């Protein structure tokens, strides 16, 4: 979905493998704030919110607490005390169209 | 998102995982570490906490 209509999914009551995601090395940006990337597999959480959208590359760093920009201000703003991770990966091989 | 555009303007898929815990049971859990069990030896064990 669009960034202004960023897709929200709720994850609960399952085993979530974050070691493979961390060791995938297929994601350009992997920044966790408020959590330990190595301890992600070692913790249990009441609920997970998966927030999916597509942006430009230069705005990838803008999806982080304390960041500013059009997307941050008007599309999706992260709180200063945000607890979670951001995973961004290029989609040129899938989002390339003629014209 | 033109093919000839720069990498800074190239399309990027972004997913943010937000982890909330409340006065409710924990539902999502990470994978458990399984180690081969050994018998007839004085060993340290941890079964389901």
């Amino acid at each position, epitope marked *: 979905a*669009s960034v202004y209509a960023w897709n929200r999914k709720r994850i609960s009551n399952c085993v979530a493998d974050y070691s493979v995601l961390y060791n995938s090395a297929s994601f350009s940006t992997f920044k966790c704030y408020g959590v330990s990337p190595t301890k992600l597999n070692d913790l249990c959480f009441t609920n997970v919110y998966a927030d999916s959208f597509v942006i430009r590359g*230069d705005e990838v760093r803008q999806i982080a607490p304390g960041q500013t920009g*059009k997307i941050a201000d008007y599309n999706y703003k992260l709180p200063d005390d945000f607890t979670g991770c951001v995973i961004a990966w290029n989609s040129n091989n899938l989002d390339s*169209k003629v*014209g | 998102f*033109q093919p000839t555009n*720069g990498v*800074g*303007y190239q399309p990027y898929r972004v997913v943010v995982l937000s982890f909330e815990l409340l006065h409710a049971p924990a539902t999502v859990c990470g994978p458990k570490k399984s180690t081969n069990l050994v018998k007839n030896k004085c060993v340290n064990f941890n079964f389901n906490g």
Partner: nanobody, 121 residues
Framework: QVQLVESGGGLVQAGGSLRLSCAAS????????MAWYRQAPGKEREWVAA????????RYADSVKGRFTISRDNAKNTVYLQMNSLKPEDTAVYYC??????????????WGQGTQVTVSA
């Protein structure tokens, strides 16, 4: 290279109909917004019509509502612009316009050539 061309128009008597075509090459018309403006000889320019692919389908000026329709086709990549029951106040030049965003949040407006439409009572 993005190139936009407008076809149609001319001089017609009152009560006629017209069909303008805005053809864009280099980018599909399936995007945020196409705009159409009107320029009259010796008069001020004002926004007239806009078509969007999200949210509200179309927006129009208060002087053109109820007698004027628009459609787009991505397969042949062109926008058709139909006007019925023309009025003498519609005598002006039609401009087709698109917008794009740069790297530094700078906005580039691709402007069309436009076509003259004259309505005689």
């Amino acid at each position: 290279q993005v190139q936009l061309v407008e076809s149609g128009g001319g001089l017609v008597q009152a009560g006629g109909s017209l069909r303008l075509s805005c053809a864009a090459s280099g980018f599909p018309v399936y995007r945020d917004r196409m705009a159409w403006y009107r320029q009259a000889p010796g008069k001020e320019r004002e926004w007239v019509a806009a078509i969007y692919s999200a949210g509200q389908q179309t927006r129009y000026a208060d002087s053109v509502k109820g007698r004027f329709t628009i459609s787009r086709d991505n397969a042949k990549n062109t926008v058709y612009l139909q006007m019925n029951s023309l009025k003498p106040e519609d005598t002006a030049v039609y401009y087709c316009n698109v917008k794009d965003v740069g790297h530094h949040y700078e906005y580039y407006d691709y402007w069309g050539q436009g076509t003259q439409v004259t309505v005689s009572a």
